[PDB]
């Protein structure tokens, strides 16, 4: 595992040498290939190195980050085009990636938290540094302060577990089952925030709408998963307490998913709409996760991988349109099929994946969470039908409205799509399908 | 900026989400408790347990 | 050009109601021989009111319009090639400025055409400056 | 171009001198301008426009600046234009009947024929024949003629 | 015919797909028996569907023998199809007589 | 946008292929229909007589004598 | 050119028996139809036929030939000893 | 196929000549309907309806007030079909 | 391709494929074969998510006519659509429409149906949206949401049929005729069949999809979505009957 | 076809980090040798054992 | 001849992209086809043989396809190694607590 | 080949089979090498009951053993499903009489599977499965077999 | 592929074929033909009956 870490560390100096922007991604893509060869993992931890291991769960999430963090560099070519502190920008991602790799590769719960939040600050610099609109302040704080407010109490819950278990290592924790009501709320309300839950999602539409394209990728790509990944490790020893209060979370997320889907239909901003679509699906992920069944756990792991690639993908396309039309509102963006017809194909495939269209990896995960939820209670069929219905209602509205109609009138002349953009879109979607072939690996982490 | 807890807004917000959540969260708790009670009591033979594989 | 003024004379409200009344008549009685028969009678009903005071006419339009709406067809005819028609503006033509972003080799497939457009561009600016004062 | 902070609505207008500036601020002559009721969920001093039969009922043949939206150059946009848009809940002409009328007829017909069908479920027309005499072991099937 | 009579005077009409309710040998000095032609093995070997495993099986088997003999030009076996239909018509008559018998008998008991 | 256009008039004459084709399509249909009626007239009417249950005698059904 | 515009003098309302049926009605009612000479072109019989001709042709096009082929079909069948 | 301007001049006049409440002599490119030819408003409506069916589209009631002589109608149809030849 | 119309290229492929499938359907009729090939994705809790293909005369034969009609509709469109634009765009959708309907037909597995089933829900939507007028937009939106109800129904049926350990419904339909789970699967699949077939009150969308080009209407309302629901029920006819 | 230049020569430094990273963890496995060929599930049979330990 | 310039967005970038992608995917397909063809035709699969009486197979012996034998032998850690490192680490970690 | 088409059918099957058999016999098979691959065998390890409450290696030993046995037991059900799967296809239309015994084998296996691994969800481990058994047995002696209720 | 590399018992992936019983009709060989598969081990063998182990 140290092979990855020391590779990244020695790539830090590449931020300082000039005319090395493009030589960075290749080193970032090549390491993904090298990491892609060392899959021999199992449910239990493997490749121990001083505190760094990796199981099938951590592997897929790590590999997802390397892929996504590599696409960030492709997407944010404008930073290179205007030399807008590109060297500092590169160092932000290389640091950020290292924090993620450690976070998932950490074997002890305290470490996971140590790099859990620490990744936030590199993200926070990203929003303020390279965001256009003035609201990146008022969205910079929300991201920082919702997270800190609920992560600091989690730190107490972590330490209280040493004095009982005597250690942080995940395997040793699973041997215990705790009965204290507050402790349950000090290790899940901290992750329920970052999922996010419907009622505490108020930061998500602000952070995503204002953050740059690259920040949108990682915020939607890996930050929403750290909440999901964290839960998968800490419901193991909260099984008893999970049964007394699960019905509160399931109802909120399920009803939260439906209500947000209606909110999606009344949006008029591409960035906002995609961001609210994240809350909709993340409600199903959390819902199935708390069902605790074998299906709900394997499925939740799957959907987190698939959704991140998609929602990250859809943020590419919004940036492409915004870069030229200059406005992210739906009213400006119309009939793009008649300006950039080649682009509209990628709009569809990424859009179709978001609505659980086949043969994507997204449908495999969504079939499963749906199974666990139904088994949990037949009453869940009511909204789970509504949520899947409306989860396509806004996706069509997102795609159709922005691509189909007659062209805008005031738009000034702008460049057409470039090869970089097409290559970026392929790398987002094409794995999202081929992964179905080897779901063997990225599914059975239990 | 133009929001105010004017009662109409409260009445709007009350029925909008809070009761759908509360009523439906109540339904989930009710249905599972009834179903759970049978299992704990030992009513359902393992032959008849639904969703064996879930 | 001329942009229509929203204010509509009472004389025009009768005119429009007459046009709508006849077009509605066609939908019910498609056939021309029947249509021309009934359309003639419809024109008669207007001439038996042509000699009336406007204030009385105000009462006429009100019931004249309501009965029309009360007798609207469930599938009114339109012209397929015009506003509201089933086949209206099917195709959308991008703005001219698209052409200028073709790859230079692509432009080589129509060298005459792009040769001319750039002569027009020279004329267009002088035309635009005069029209809007530059 | 400005930013959102430079364009968000001002607080609800309270005075005629304030109304006139507000109407000016949205390119409206002072008679159109009509802020929302300000119950507490109001949109501030933003106008109230549309809310009628919908966008598609606007004159199609007028030479709009933006034909696609059927809107003019600097004209404001209704706060619920996303709902009364041409593809959303709008119609070209007023509906023939009251909204209640349509639901009654369709459901009224449907219920009126659900009961009839189910009342006749017993009185199935059957041809005058006995059941298939599938050969079963140890059972005695005959043929009529001696 | 119809089935309102069964609704208005159910005492006389045996009803839909009526199974016989009187003794089969009643009112008969005797009534001869019915004989199968096709064994279980023969029915299974040709994958004869269960609803077609009635007394007409042997003719149905003969139909497949010929039909498979000239496939796809099955019109060259139109003659064989006539017999199988010629036979299954008889069973429909037997079911009809079986029905009338009960209807006539059911009337008799009402009278007495 | 067919290249042919006619104003207050019937369309132009028809090529030989179109003239023949109309008869061949219509003619081919009728030839099929007639032949089936000739060779299979027993499908429109019942290919098997519907027996008059009433005509049957009480004895042949073995109805006992009251 | 795509077409030629005929002269208004050509169209005479008395040609079409169907339109003339309208005028006697309007005379009885007391009105007059100005836009009547327009409709004449639709009912030119030589180029549009009548209701009867269009109906006979539409249903029975090729029936005469269709029967004639059938007679050959019966001929071959008899010559192949099939009909009996 | 392209609709030549000369044909538009022919097609318009053909319809007007067939209209029985007009004079075939006065009828010319430049004549006015309500002024010269003594057409009523309702009569002028019927003429436009013929023009609509003649060429196959709607002439908006707002824009029919500009059509006060057959030359204007000729220009209108030419503009819609953008045949300026 | 650069010198051959994609319609000309397309037609020969489909007709030859249709003709070959026709020969097979005859072969499967003679022997009364049933072939069931399937590839496996992942398994857990004694369960398996698979792609499955059931080749019998009924599947193969109807698969042929979908190709025969489709081939001619493409060739027909060579002249219907020569005039506007984007013939290459249009036909590449129609081909994707055939394959989706093809996979729907063959599928004997409830999960595998979703592949062709949802693909039809999407590709069909694109064709309806083909023209750029507003009327097409409203038409296309109505169909996808109308079919998306059927899409939702099958998703719940998948969860319920988990109780029997598999999604090869063509094997359990006739031995589990009584139990409540089949009645719950048959209940949901009925909705999925009703929506694609445009029954009451879902009939509204089928007239709306006329906004598509006429070749599309031939493909959607002759050998596809309208017939999709019927074929699904033909595979579920036991519990329904 | 690669389209790589002398700037990629700097790539050796990250590859240097790879080998150093590989070396340490490989050295770590040589520190993991107290259940090596001793666990109940892979432990060697008691007596007549292979000279070189597996892994 | 007689055709009308119909204005459409440029396709060159898309045309170029489809070409470049097709080139580089082929640039990988020919090697792997050579390897998989070389592996299957010349090396071939193993044969499932019963374990001799007292024989200890090396971990790579437990798999069939020759390429899979190669990966597990020189590219990946044996399953025993990860199993028995994990035992050590859990042992030491348990001693912490 | 009594049928005309079947006579043509076999003609094609000769055409598609002829080359591949030759190709298999001519190139692939003759040029390959002899090599044998074996089957993993796992020595049974002590169950969780013998493990102490403080040692983790012994618990880790059993947890992995429990998981491997779970897979074997997950799919021994899968095999039995495929048998009833295959009988229904190889015996239709008269398949009810023949699949009925196979389904009886299947349903019994599921219950034994569900009595052992059932209702544990994910995170099921040797400790949890064994402890379900201890509670199940206690209830059995006190209230009799499940499904009869308590006393 | 469907003649040699079809799915067998030593793998999970790969295409797996379960064909039905051909209609045996008179004139065919041994008309009173019966399914040779009787014991449960016969079904879904996947080539397992002829393995060496
Ligand atoms: C990878 C890049 C690529 O080469 O794409 C395949 C490429 C599509 O680009 P193209 O060949 O240049 O087509 C341009 C048209 O000729 C000329 O048309 P165009 O250049 O104007 O572009 C037409 C169209 C381009 O898209 C199409 O016309 C359809 C192309 C076939 C679908 C290919 C993607 C399928 C992914 C699902 C698997 O773009 C659109 O705007 C269509 C709107 C989006 C609708 C997409 C509907 C398919 C969804 C699939 C759902 C699966 C169920 O064509 C193929 O090679 C077929 C795929 C081979 C399998
Ligand atoms: C709806 C969800 C659909 C998900 C994808 C369904 C599987 C479709 C293709 C299956 C397949 O790849 O064939 C496998 C087989 C390949 O062999 P195989 O997958 O059967 O297994 C042999 C061993 N491995 C896995 C190493 C190859 O055929 C092919 O892949 C096509 C030829 C090679 C390319
Ligand atoms: C382990 C403990 C040691 C950790 C490493 C300590 C050293 C870190 C800082 C090393 C870089 C110092 C020089 C530098 O800042 O990079 C150059 C440039 C900064 O911007 P500029 O002012 O233009 O620099 C001109 C000098 N070349 O580069 C940049 O634009 C960004 C530089 C990174 C800034 C990080 C703060
Ligand atoms: C298409 C995908 C479906 C394929 C179905 C399939 O898997 O093959 C079925 C059949 C195998 O049946 P089997 O029992 O093995 O028959 C021989 C027994 N010794 O395999 C067969 O196809 C054998 C039956 C032959 C049927 C007719 C000949 C095969 C034609 C294949 C299609 C090509 C037709 C070309 C037509 C050209 C027209 C211009
Ligand atoms: C139930 C009745 C049958 C199923 C209908 C499902 C779709 C209903 C609404 C969408 C639709 O039908 O498409 C057309 C609609 C507007 O089209 P249009 O008829 O032209 O009217 C306004 C524009 N002039 O298009 C639209 O208005 C856009 C709609 C945007 C998405 C919101 C639609 C919500 C519809 C809720 C229907 C309730 C049924 C679904 C709930 C159960 C789901 C499990």
TrEMBL record, chain E:
UniProt keyword annotation of Zinc-finger present: no
InterPro entries the UniProt entry points to: NDUB7
A single GO BP: mitochondrial electron transport, NADH to ubiquinone
Disulfide bonds: 56-87, 66-77
Physiological role: Accessory subunit of the mitochondrial membrane respiratory chain NADH dehydrogenase (Complex I), that is believed not to be involved in catalysis. Complex I functions in the transfer of electrons from NADH to the respiratory chain. The immediate electron acceptor for the enzyme is believed to be ubiquinone.
Family under the similarity heading: Belongs to the complex I NDUFB7 subunit family.
PANTHER family cross-referenced by the UniProt entry: NADH DEHYDROGENASE [UBIQUINONE] 1 BETA SUBCOMPLEX SUBUNIT 7 (PTHR20900:SF0), NADH:UBIQUINONE OXIDOREDUCTASE B18-LIKE SUBUNIT (PTHR20900)
Protein name per UniProt: NADH dehydrogenase [ubiquinone] 1 beta subcomplex subunit 7
Source organism (scientific name): Drosophila melanogaster (Fruit fly)
Lineage: Eukaryota, Metazoa, Ecdysozoa, Arthropoda, Hexapoda
Gene: ND-B18
TrEMBL record, chain J:
InterPro entries: NDUB1
A single GO cellular-component term on record: mitochondrial inner membrane
Keyword match Electron transport: yes
Membrane topology: Single-pass membrane protein
Record's subcellular location: Mitochondrion inner membrane; Mitochondrion membrane
Electron transport is among the record's keywords: yes
Domain of life, source organism: Eukaryota
Family listed: Belongs to the complex I NDUFB1 subunit family.
Stated name of the protein: NADH dehydrogenase [ubiquinone] 1 beta subcomplex subunit 1
Organism the protein comes from: Drosophila melanogaster (Fruit fly)
From TrEMBL, chain L:
Cellular component, GO annotation: mitochondrial inner membrane; mitochondrion; respiratory chain complex I
GO BP, sorted A to Z: mitochondrial electron transport, NADH to ubiquinone
Principal subcellular localisation of the protein: mitochondrion
Presence of the UniProt keyword Transport in the record: yes
Membrane disposition: Peripheral membrane protein
Keywords, ordered alphabetically: Electron transport, Membrane, Mitochondrion, Mitochondrion inner membrane, Respiratory chain, Transport
UniProt superkingdom: Eukaryota
The keyword Amino-acid biosynthesis is assigned to this record: no
Disulfide bonds: 51-58, 87-99
Pfam families reported in the protein's UniProt record: NDUFB10
InterPro entries, per database record: NADH_UbQ_OxRdtase_su10 (IPR019377), NDUFB10 (IPR039993)
Subcellular location: Mitochondrion inner membrane
Protein family: Belongs to the complex I NDUFB10 subunit family.
UniProt-listed PANTHER family: NADH DEHYDROGENASE [UBIQUINONE] 1 BETA SUBCOMPLEX SUBUNIT 10 (PTHR13094:SF1), NADH-UBIQUINONE OXIDOREDUCTASE PDSW SUBUNIT (PTHR13094)
Protein name: NADH dehydrogenase [ubiquinone] 1 beta subcomplex subunit 10
Organism field: Drosophila melanogaster (Fruit fly)
UniProtKB/TrEMBL annotation, chain M:
Residue ranges of the region described as Disordered: 26-53
Domain of life the protein comes from: Eukaryota
Name recorded for this polypeptide: GM23292p
Species of provenance: Drosophila melanogaster (Fruit fly)
Gene: ND-B17
Complete-protein stretch covered: 113 to 165 of 167
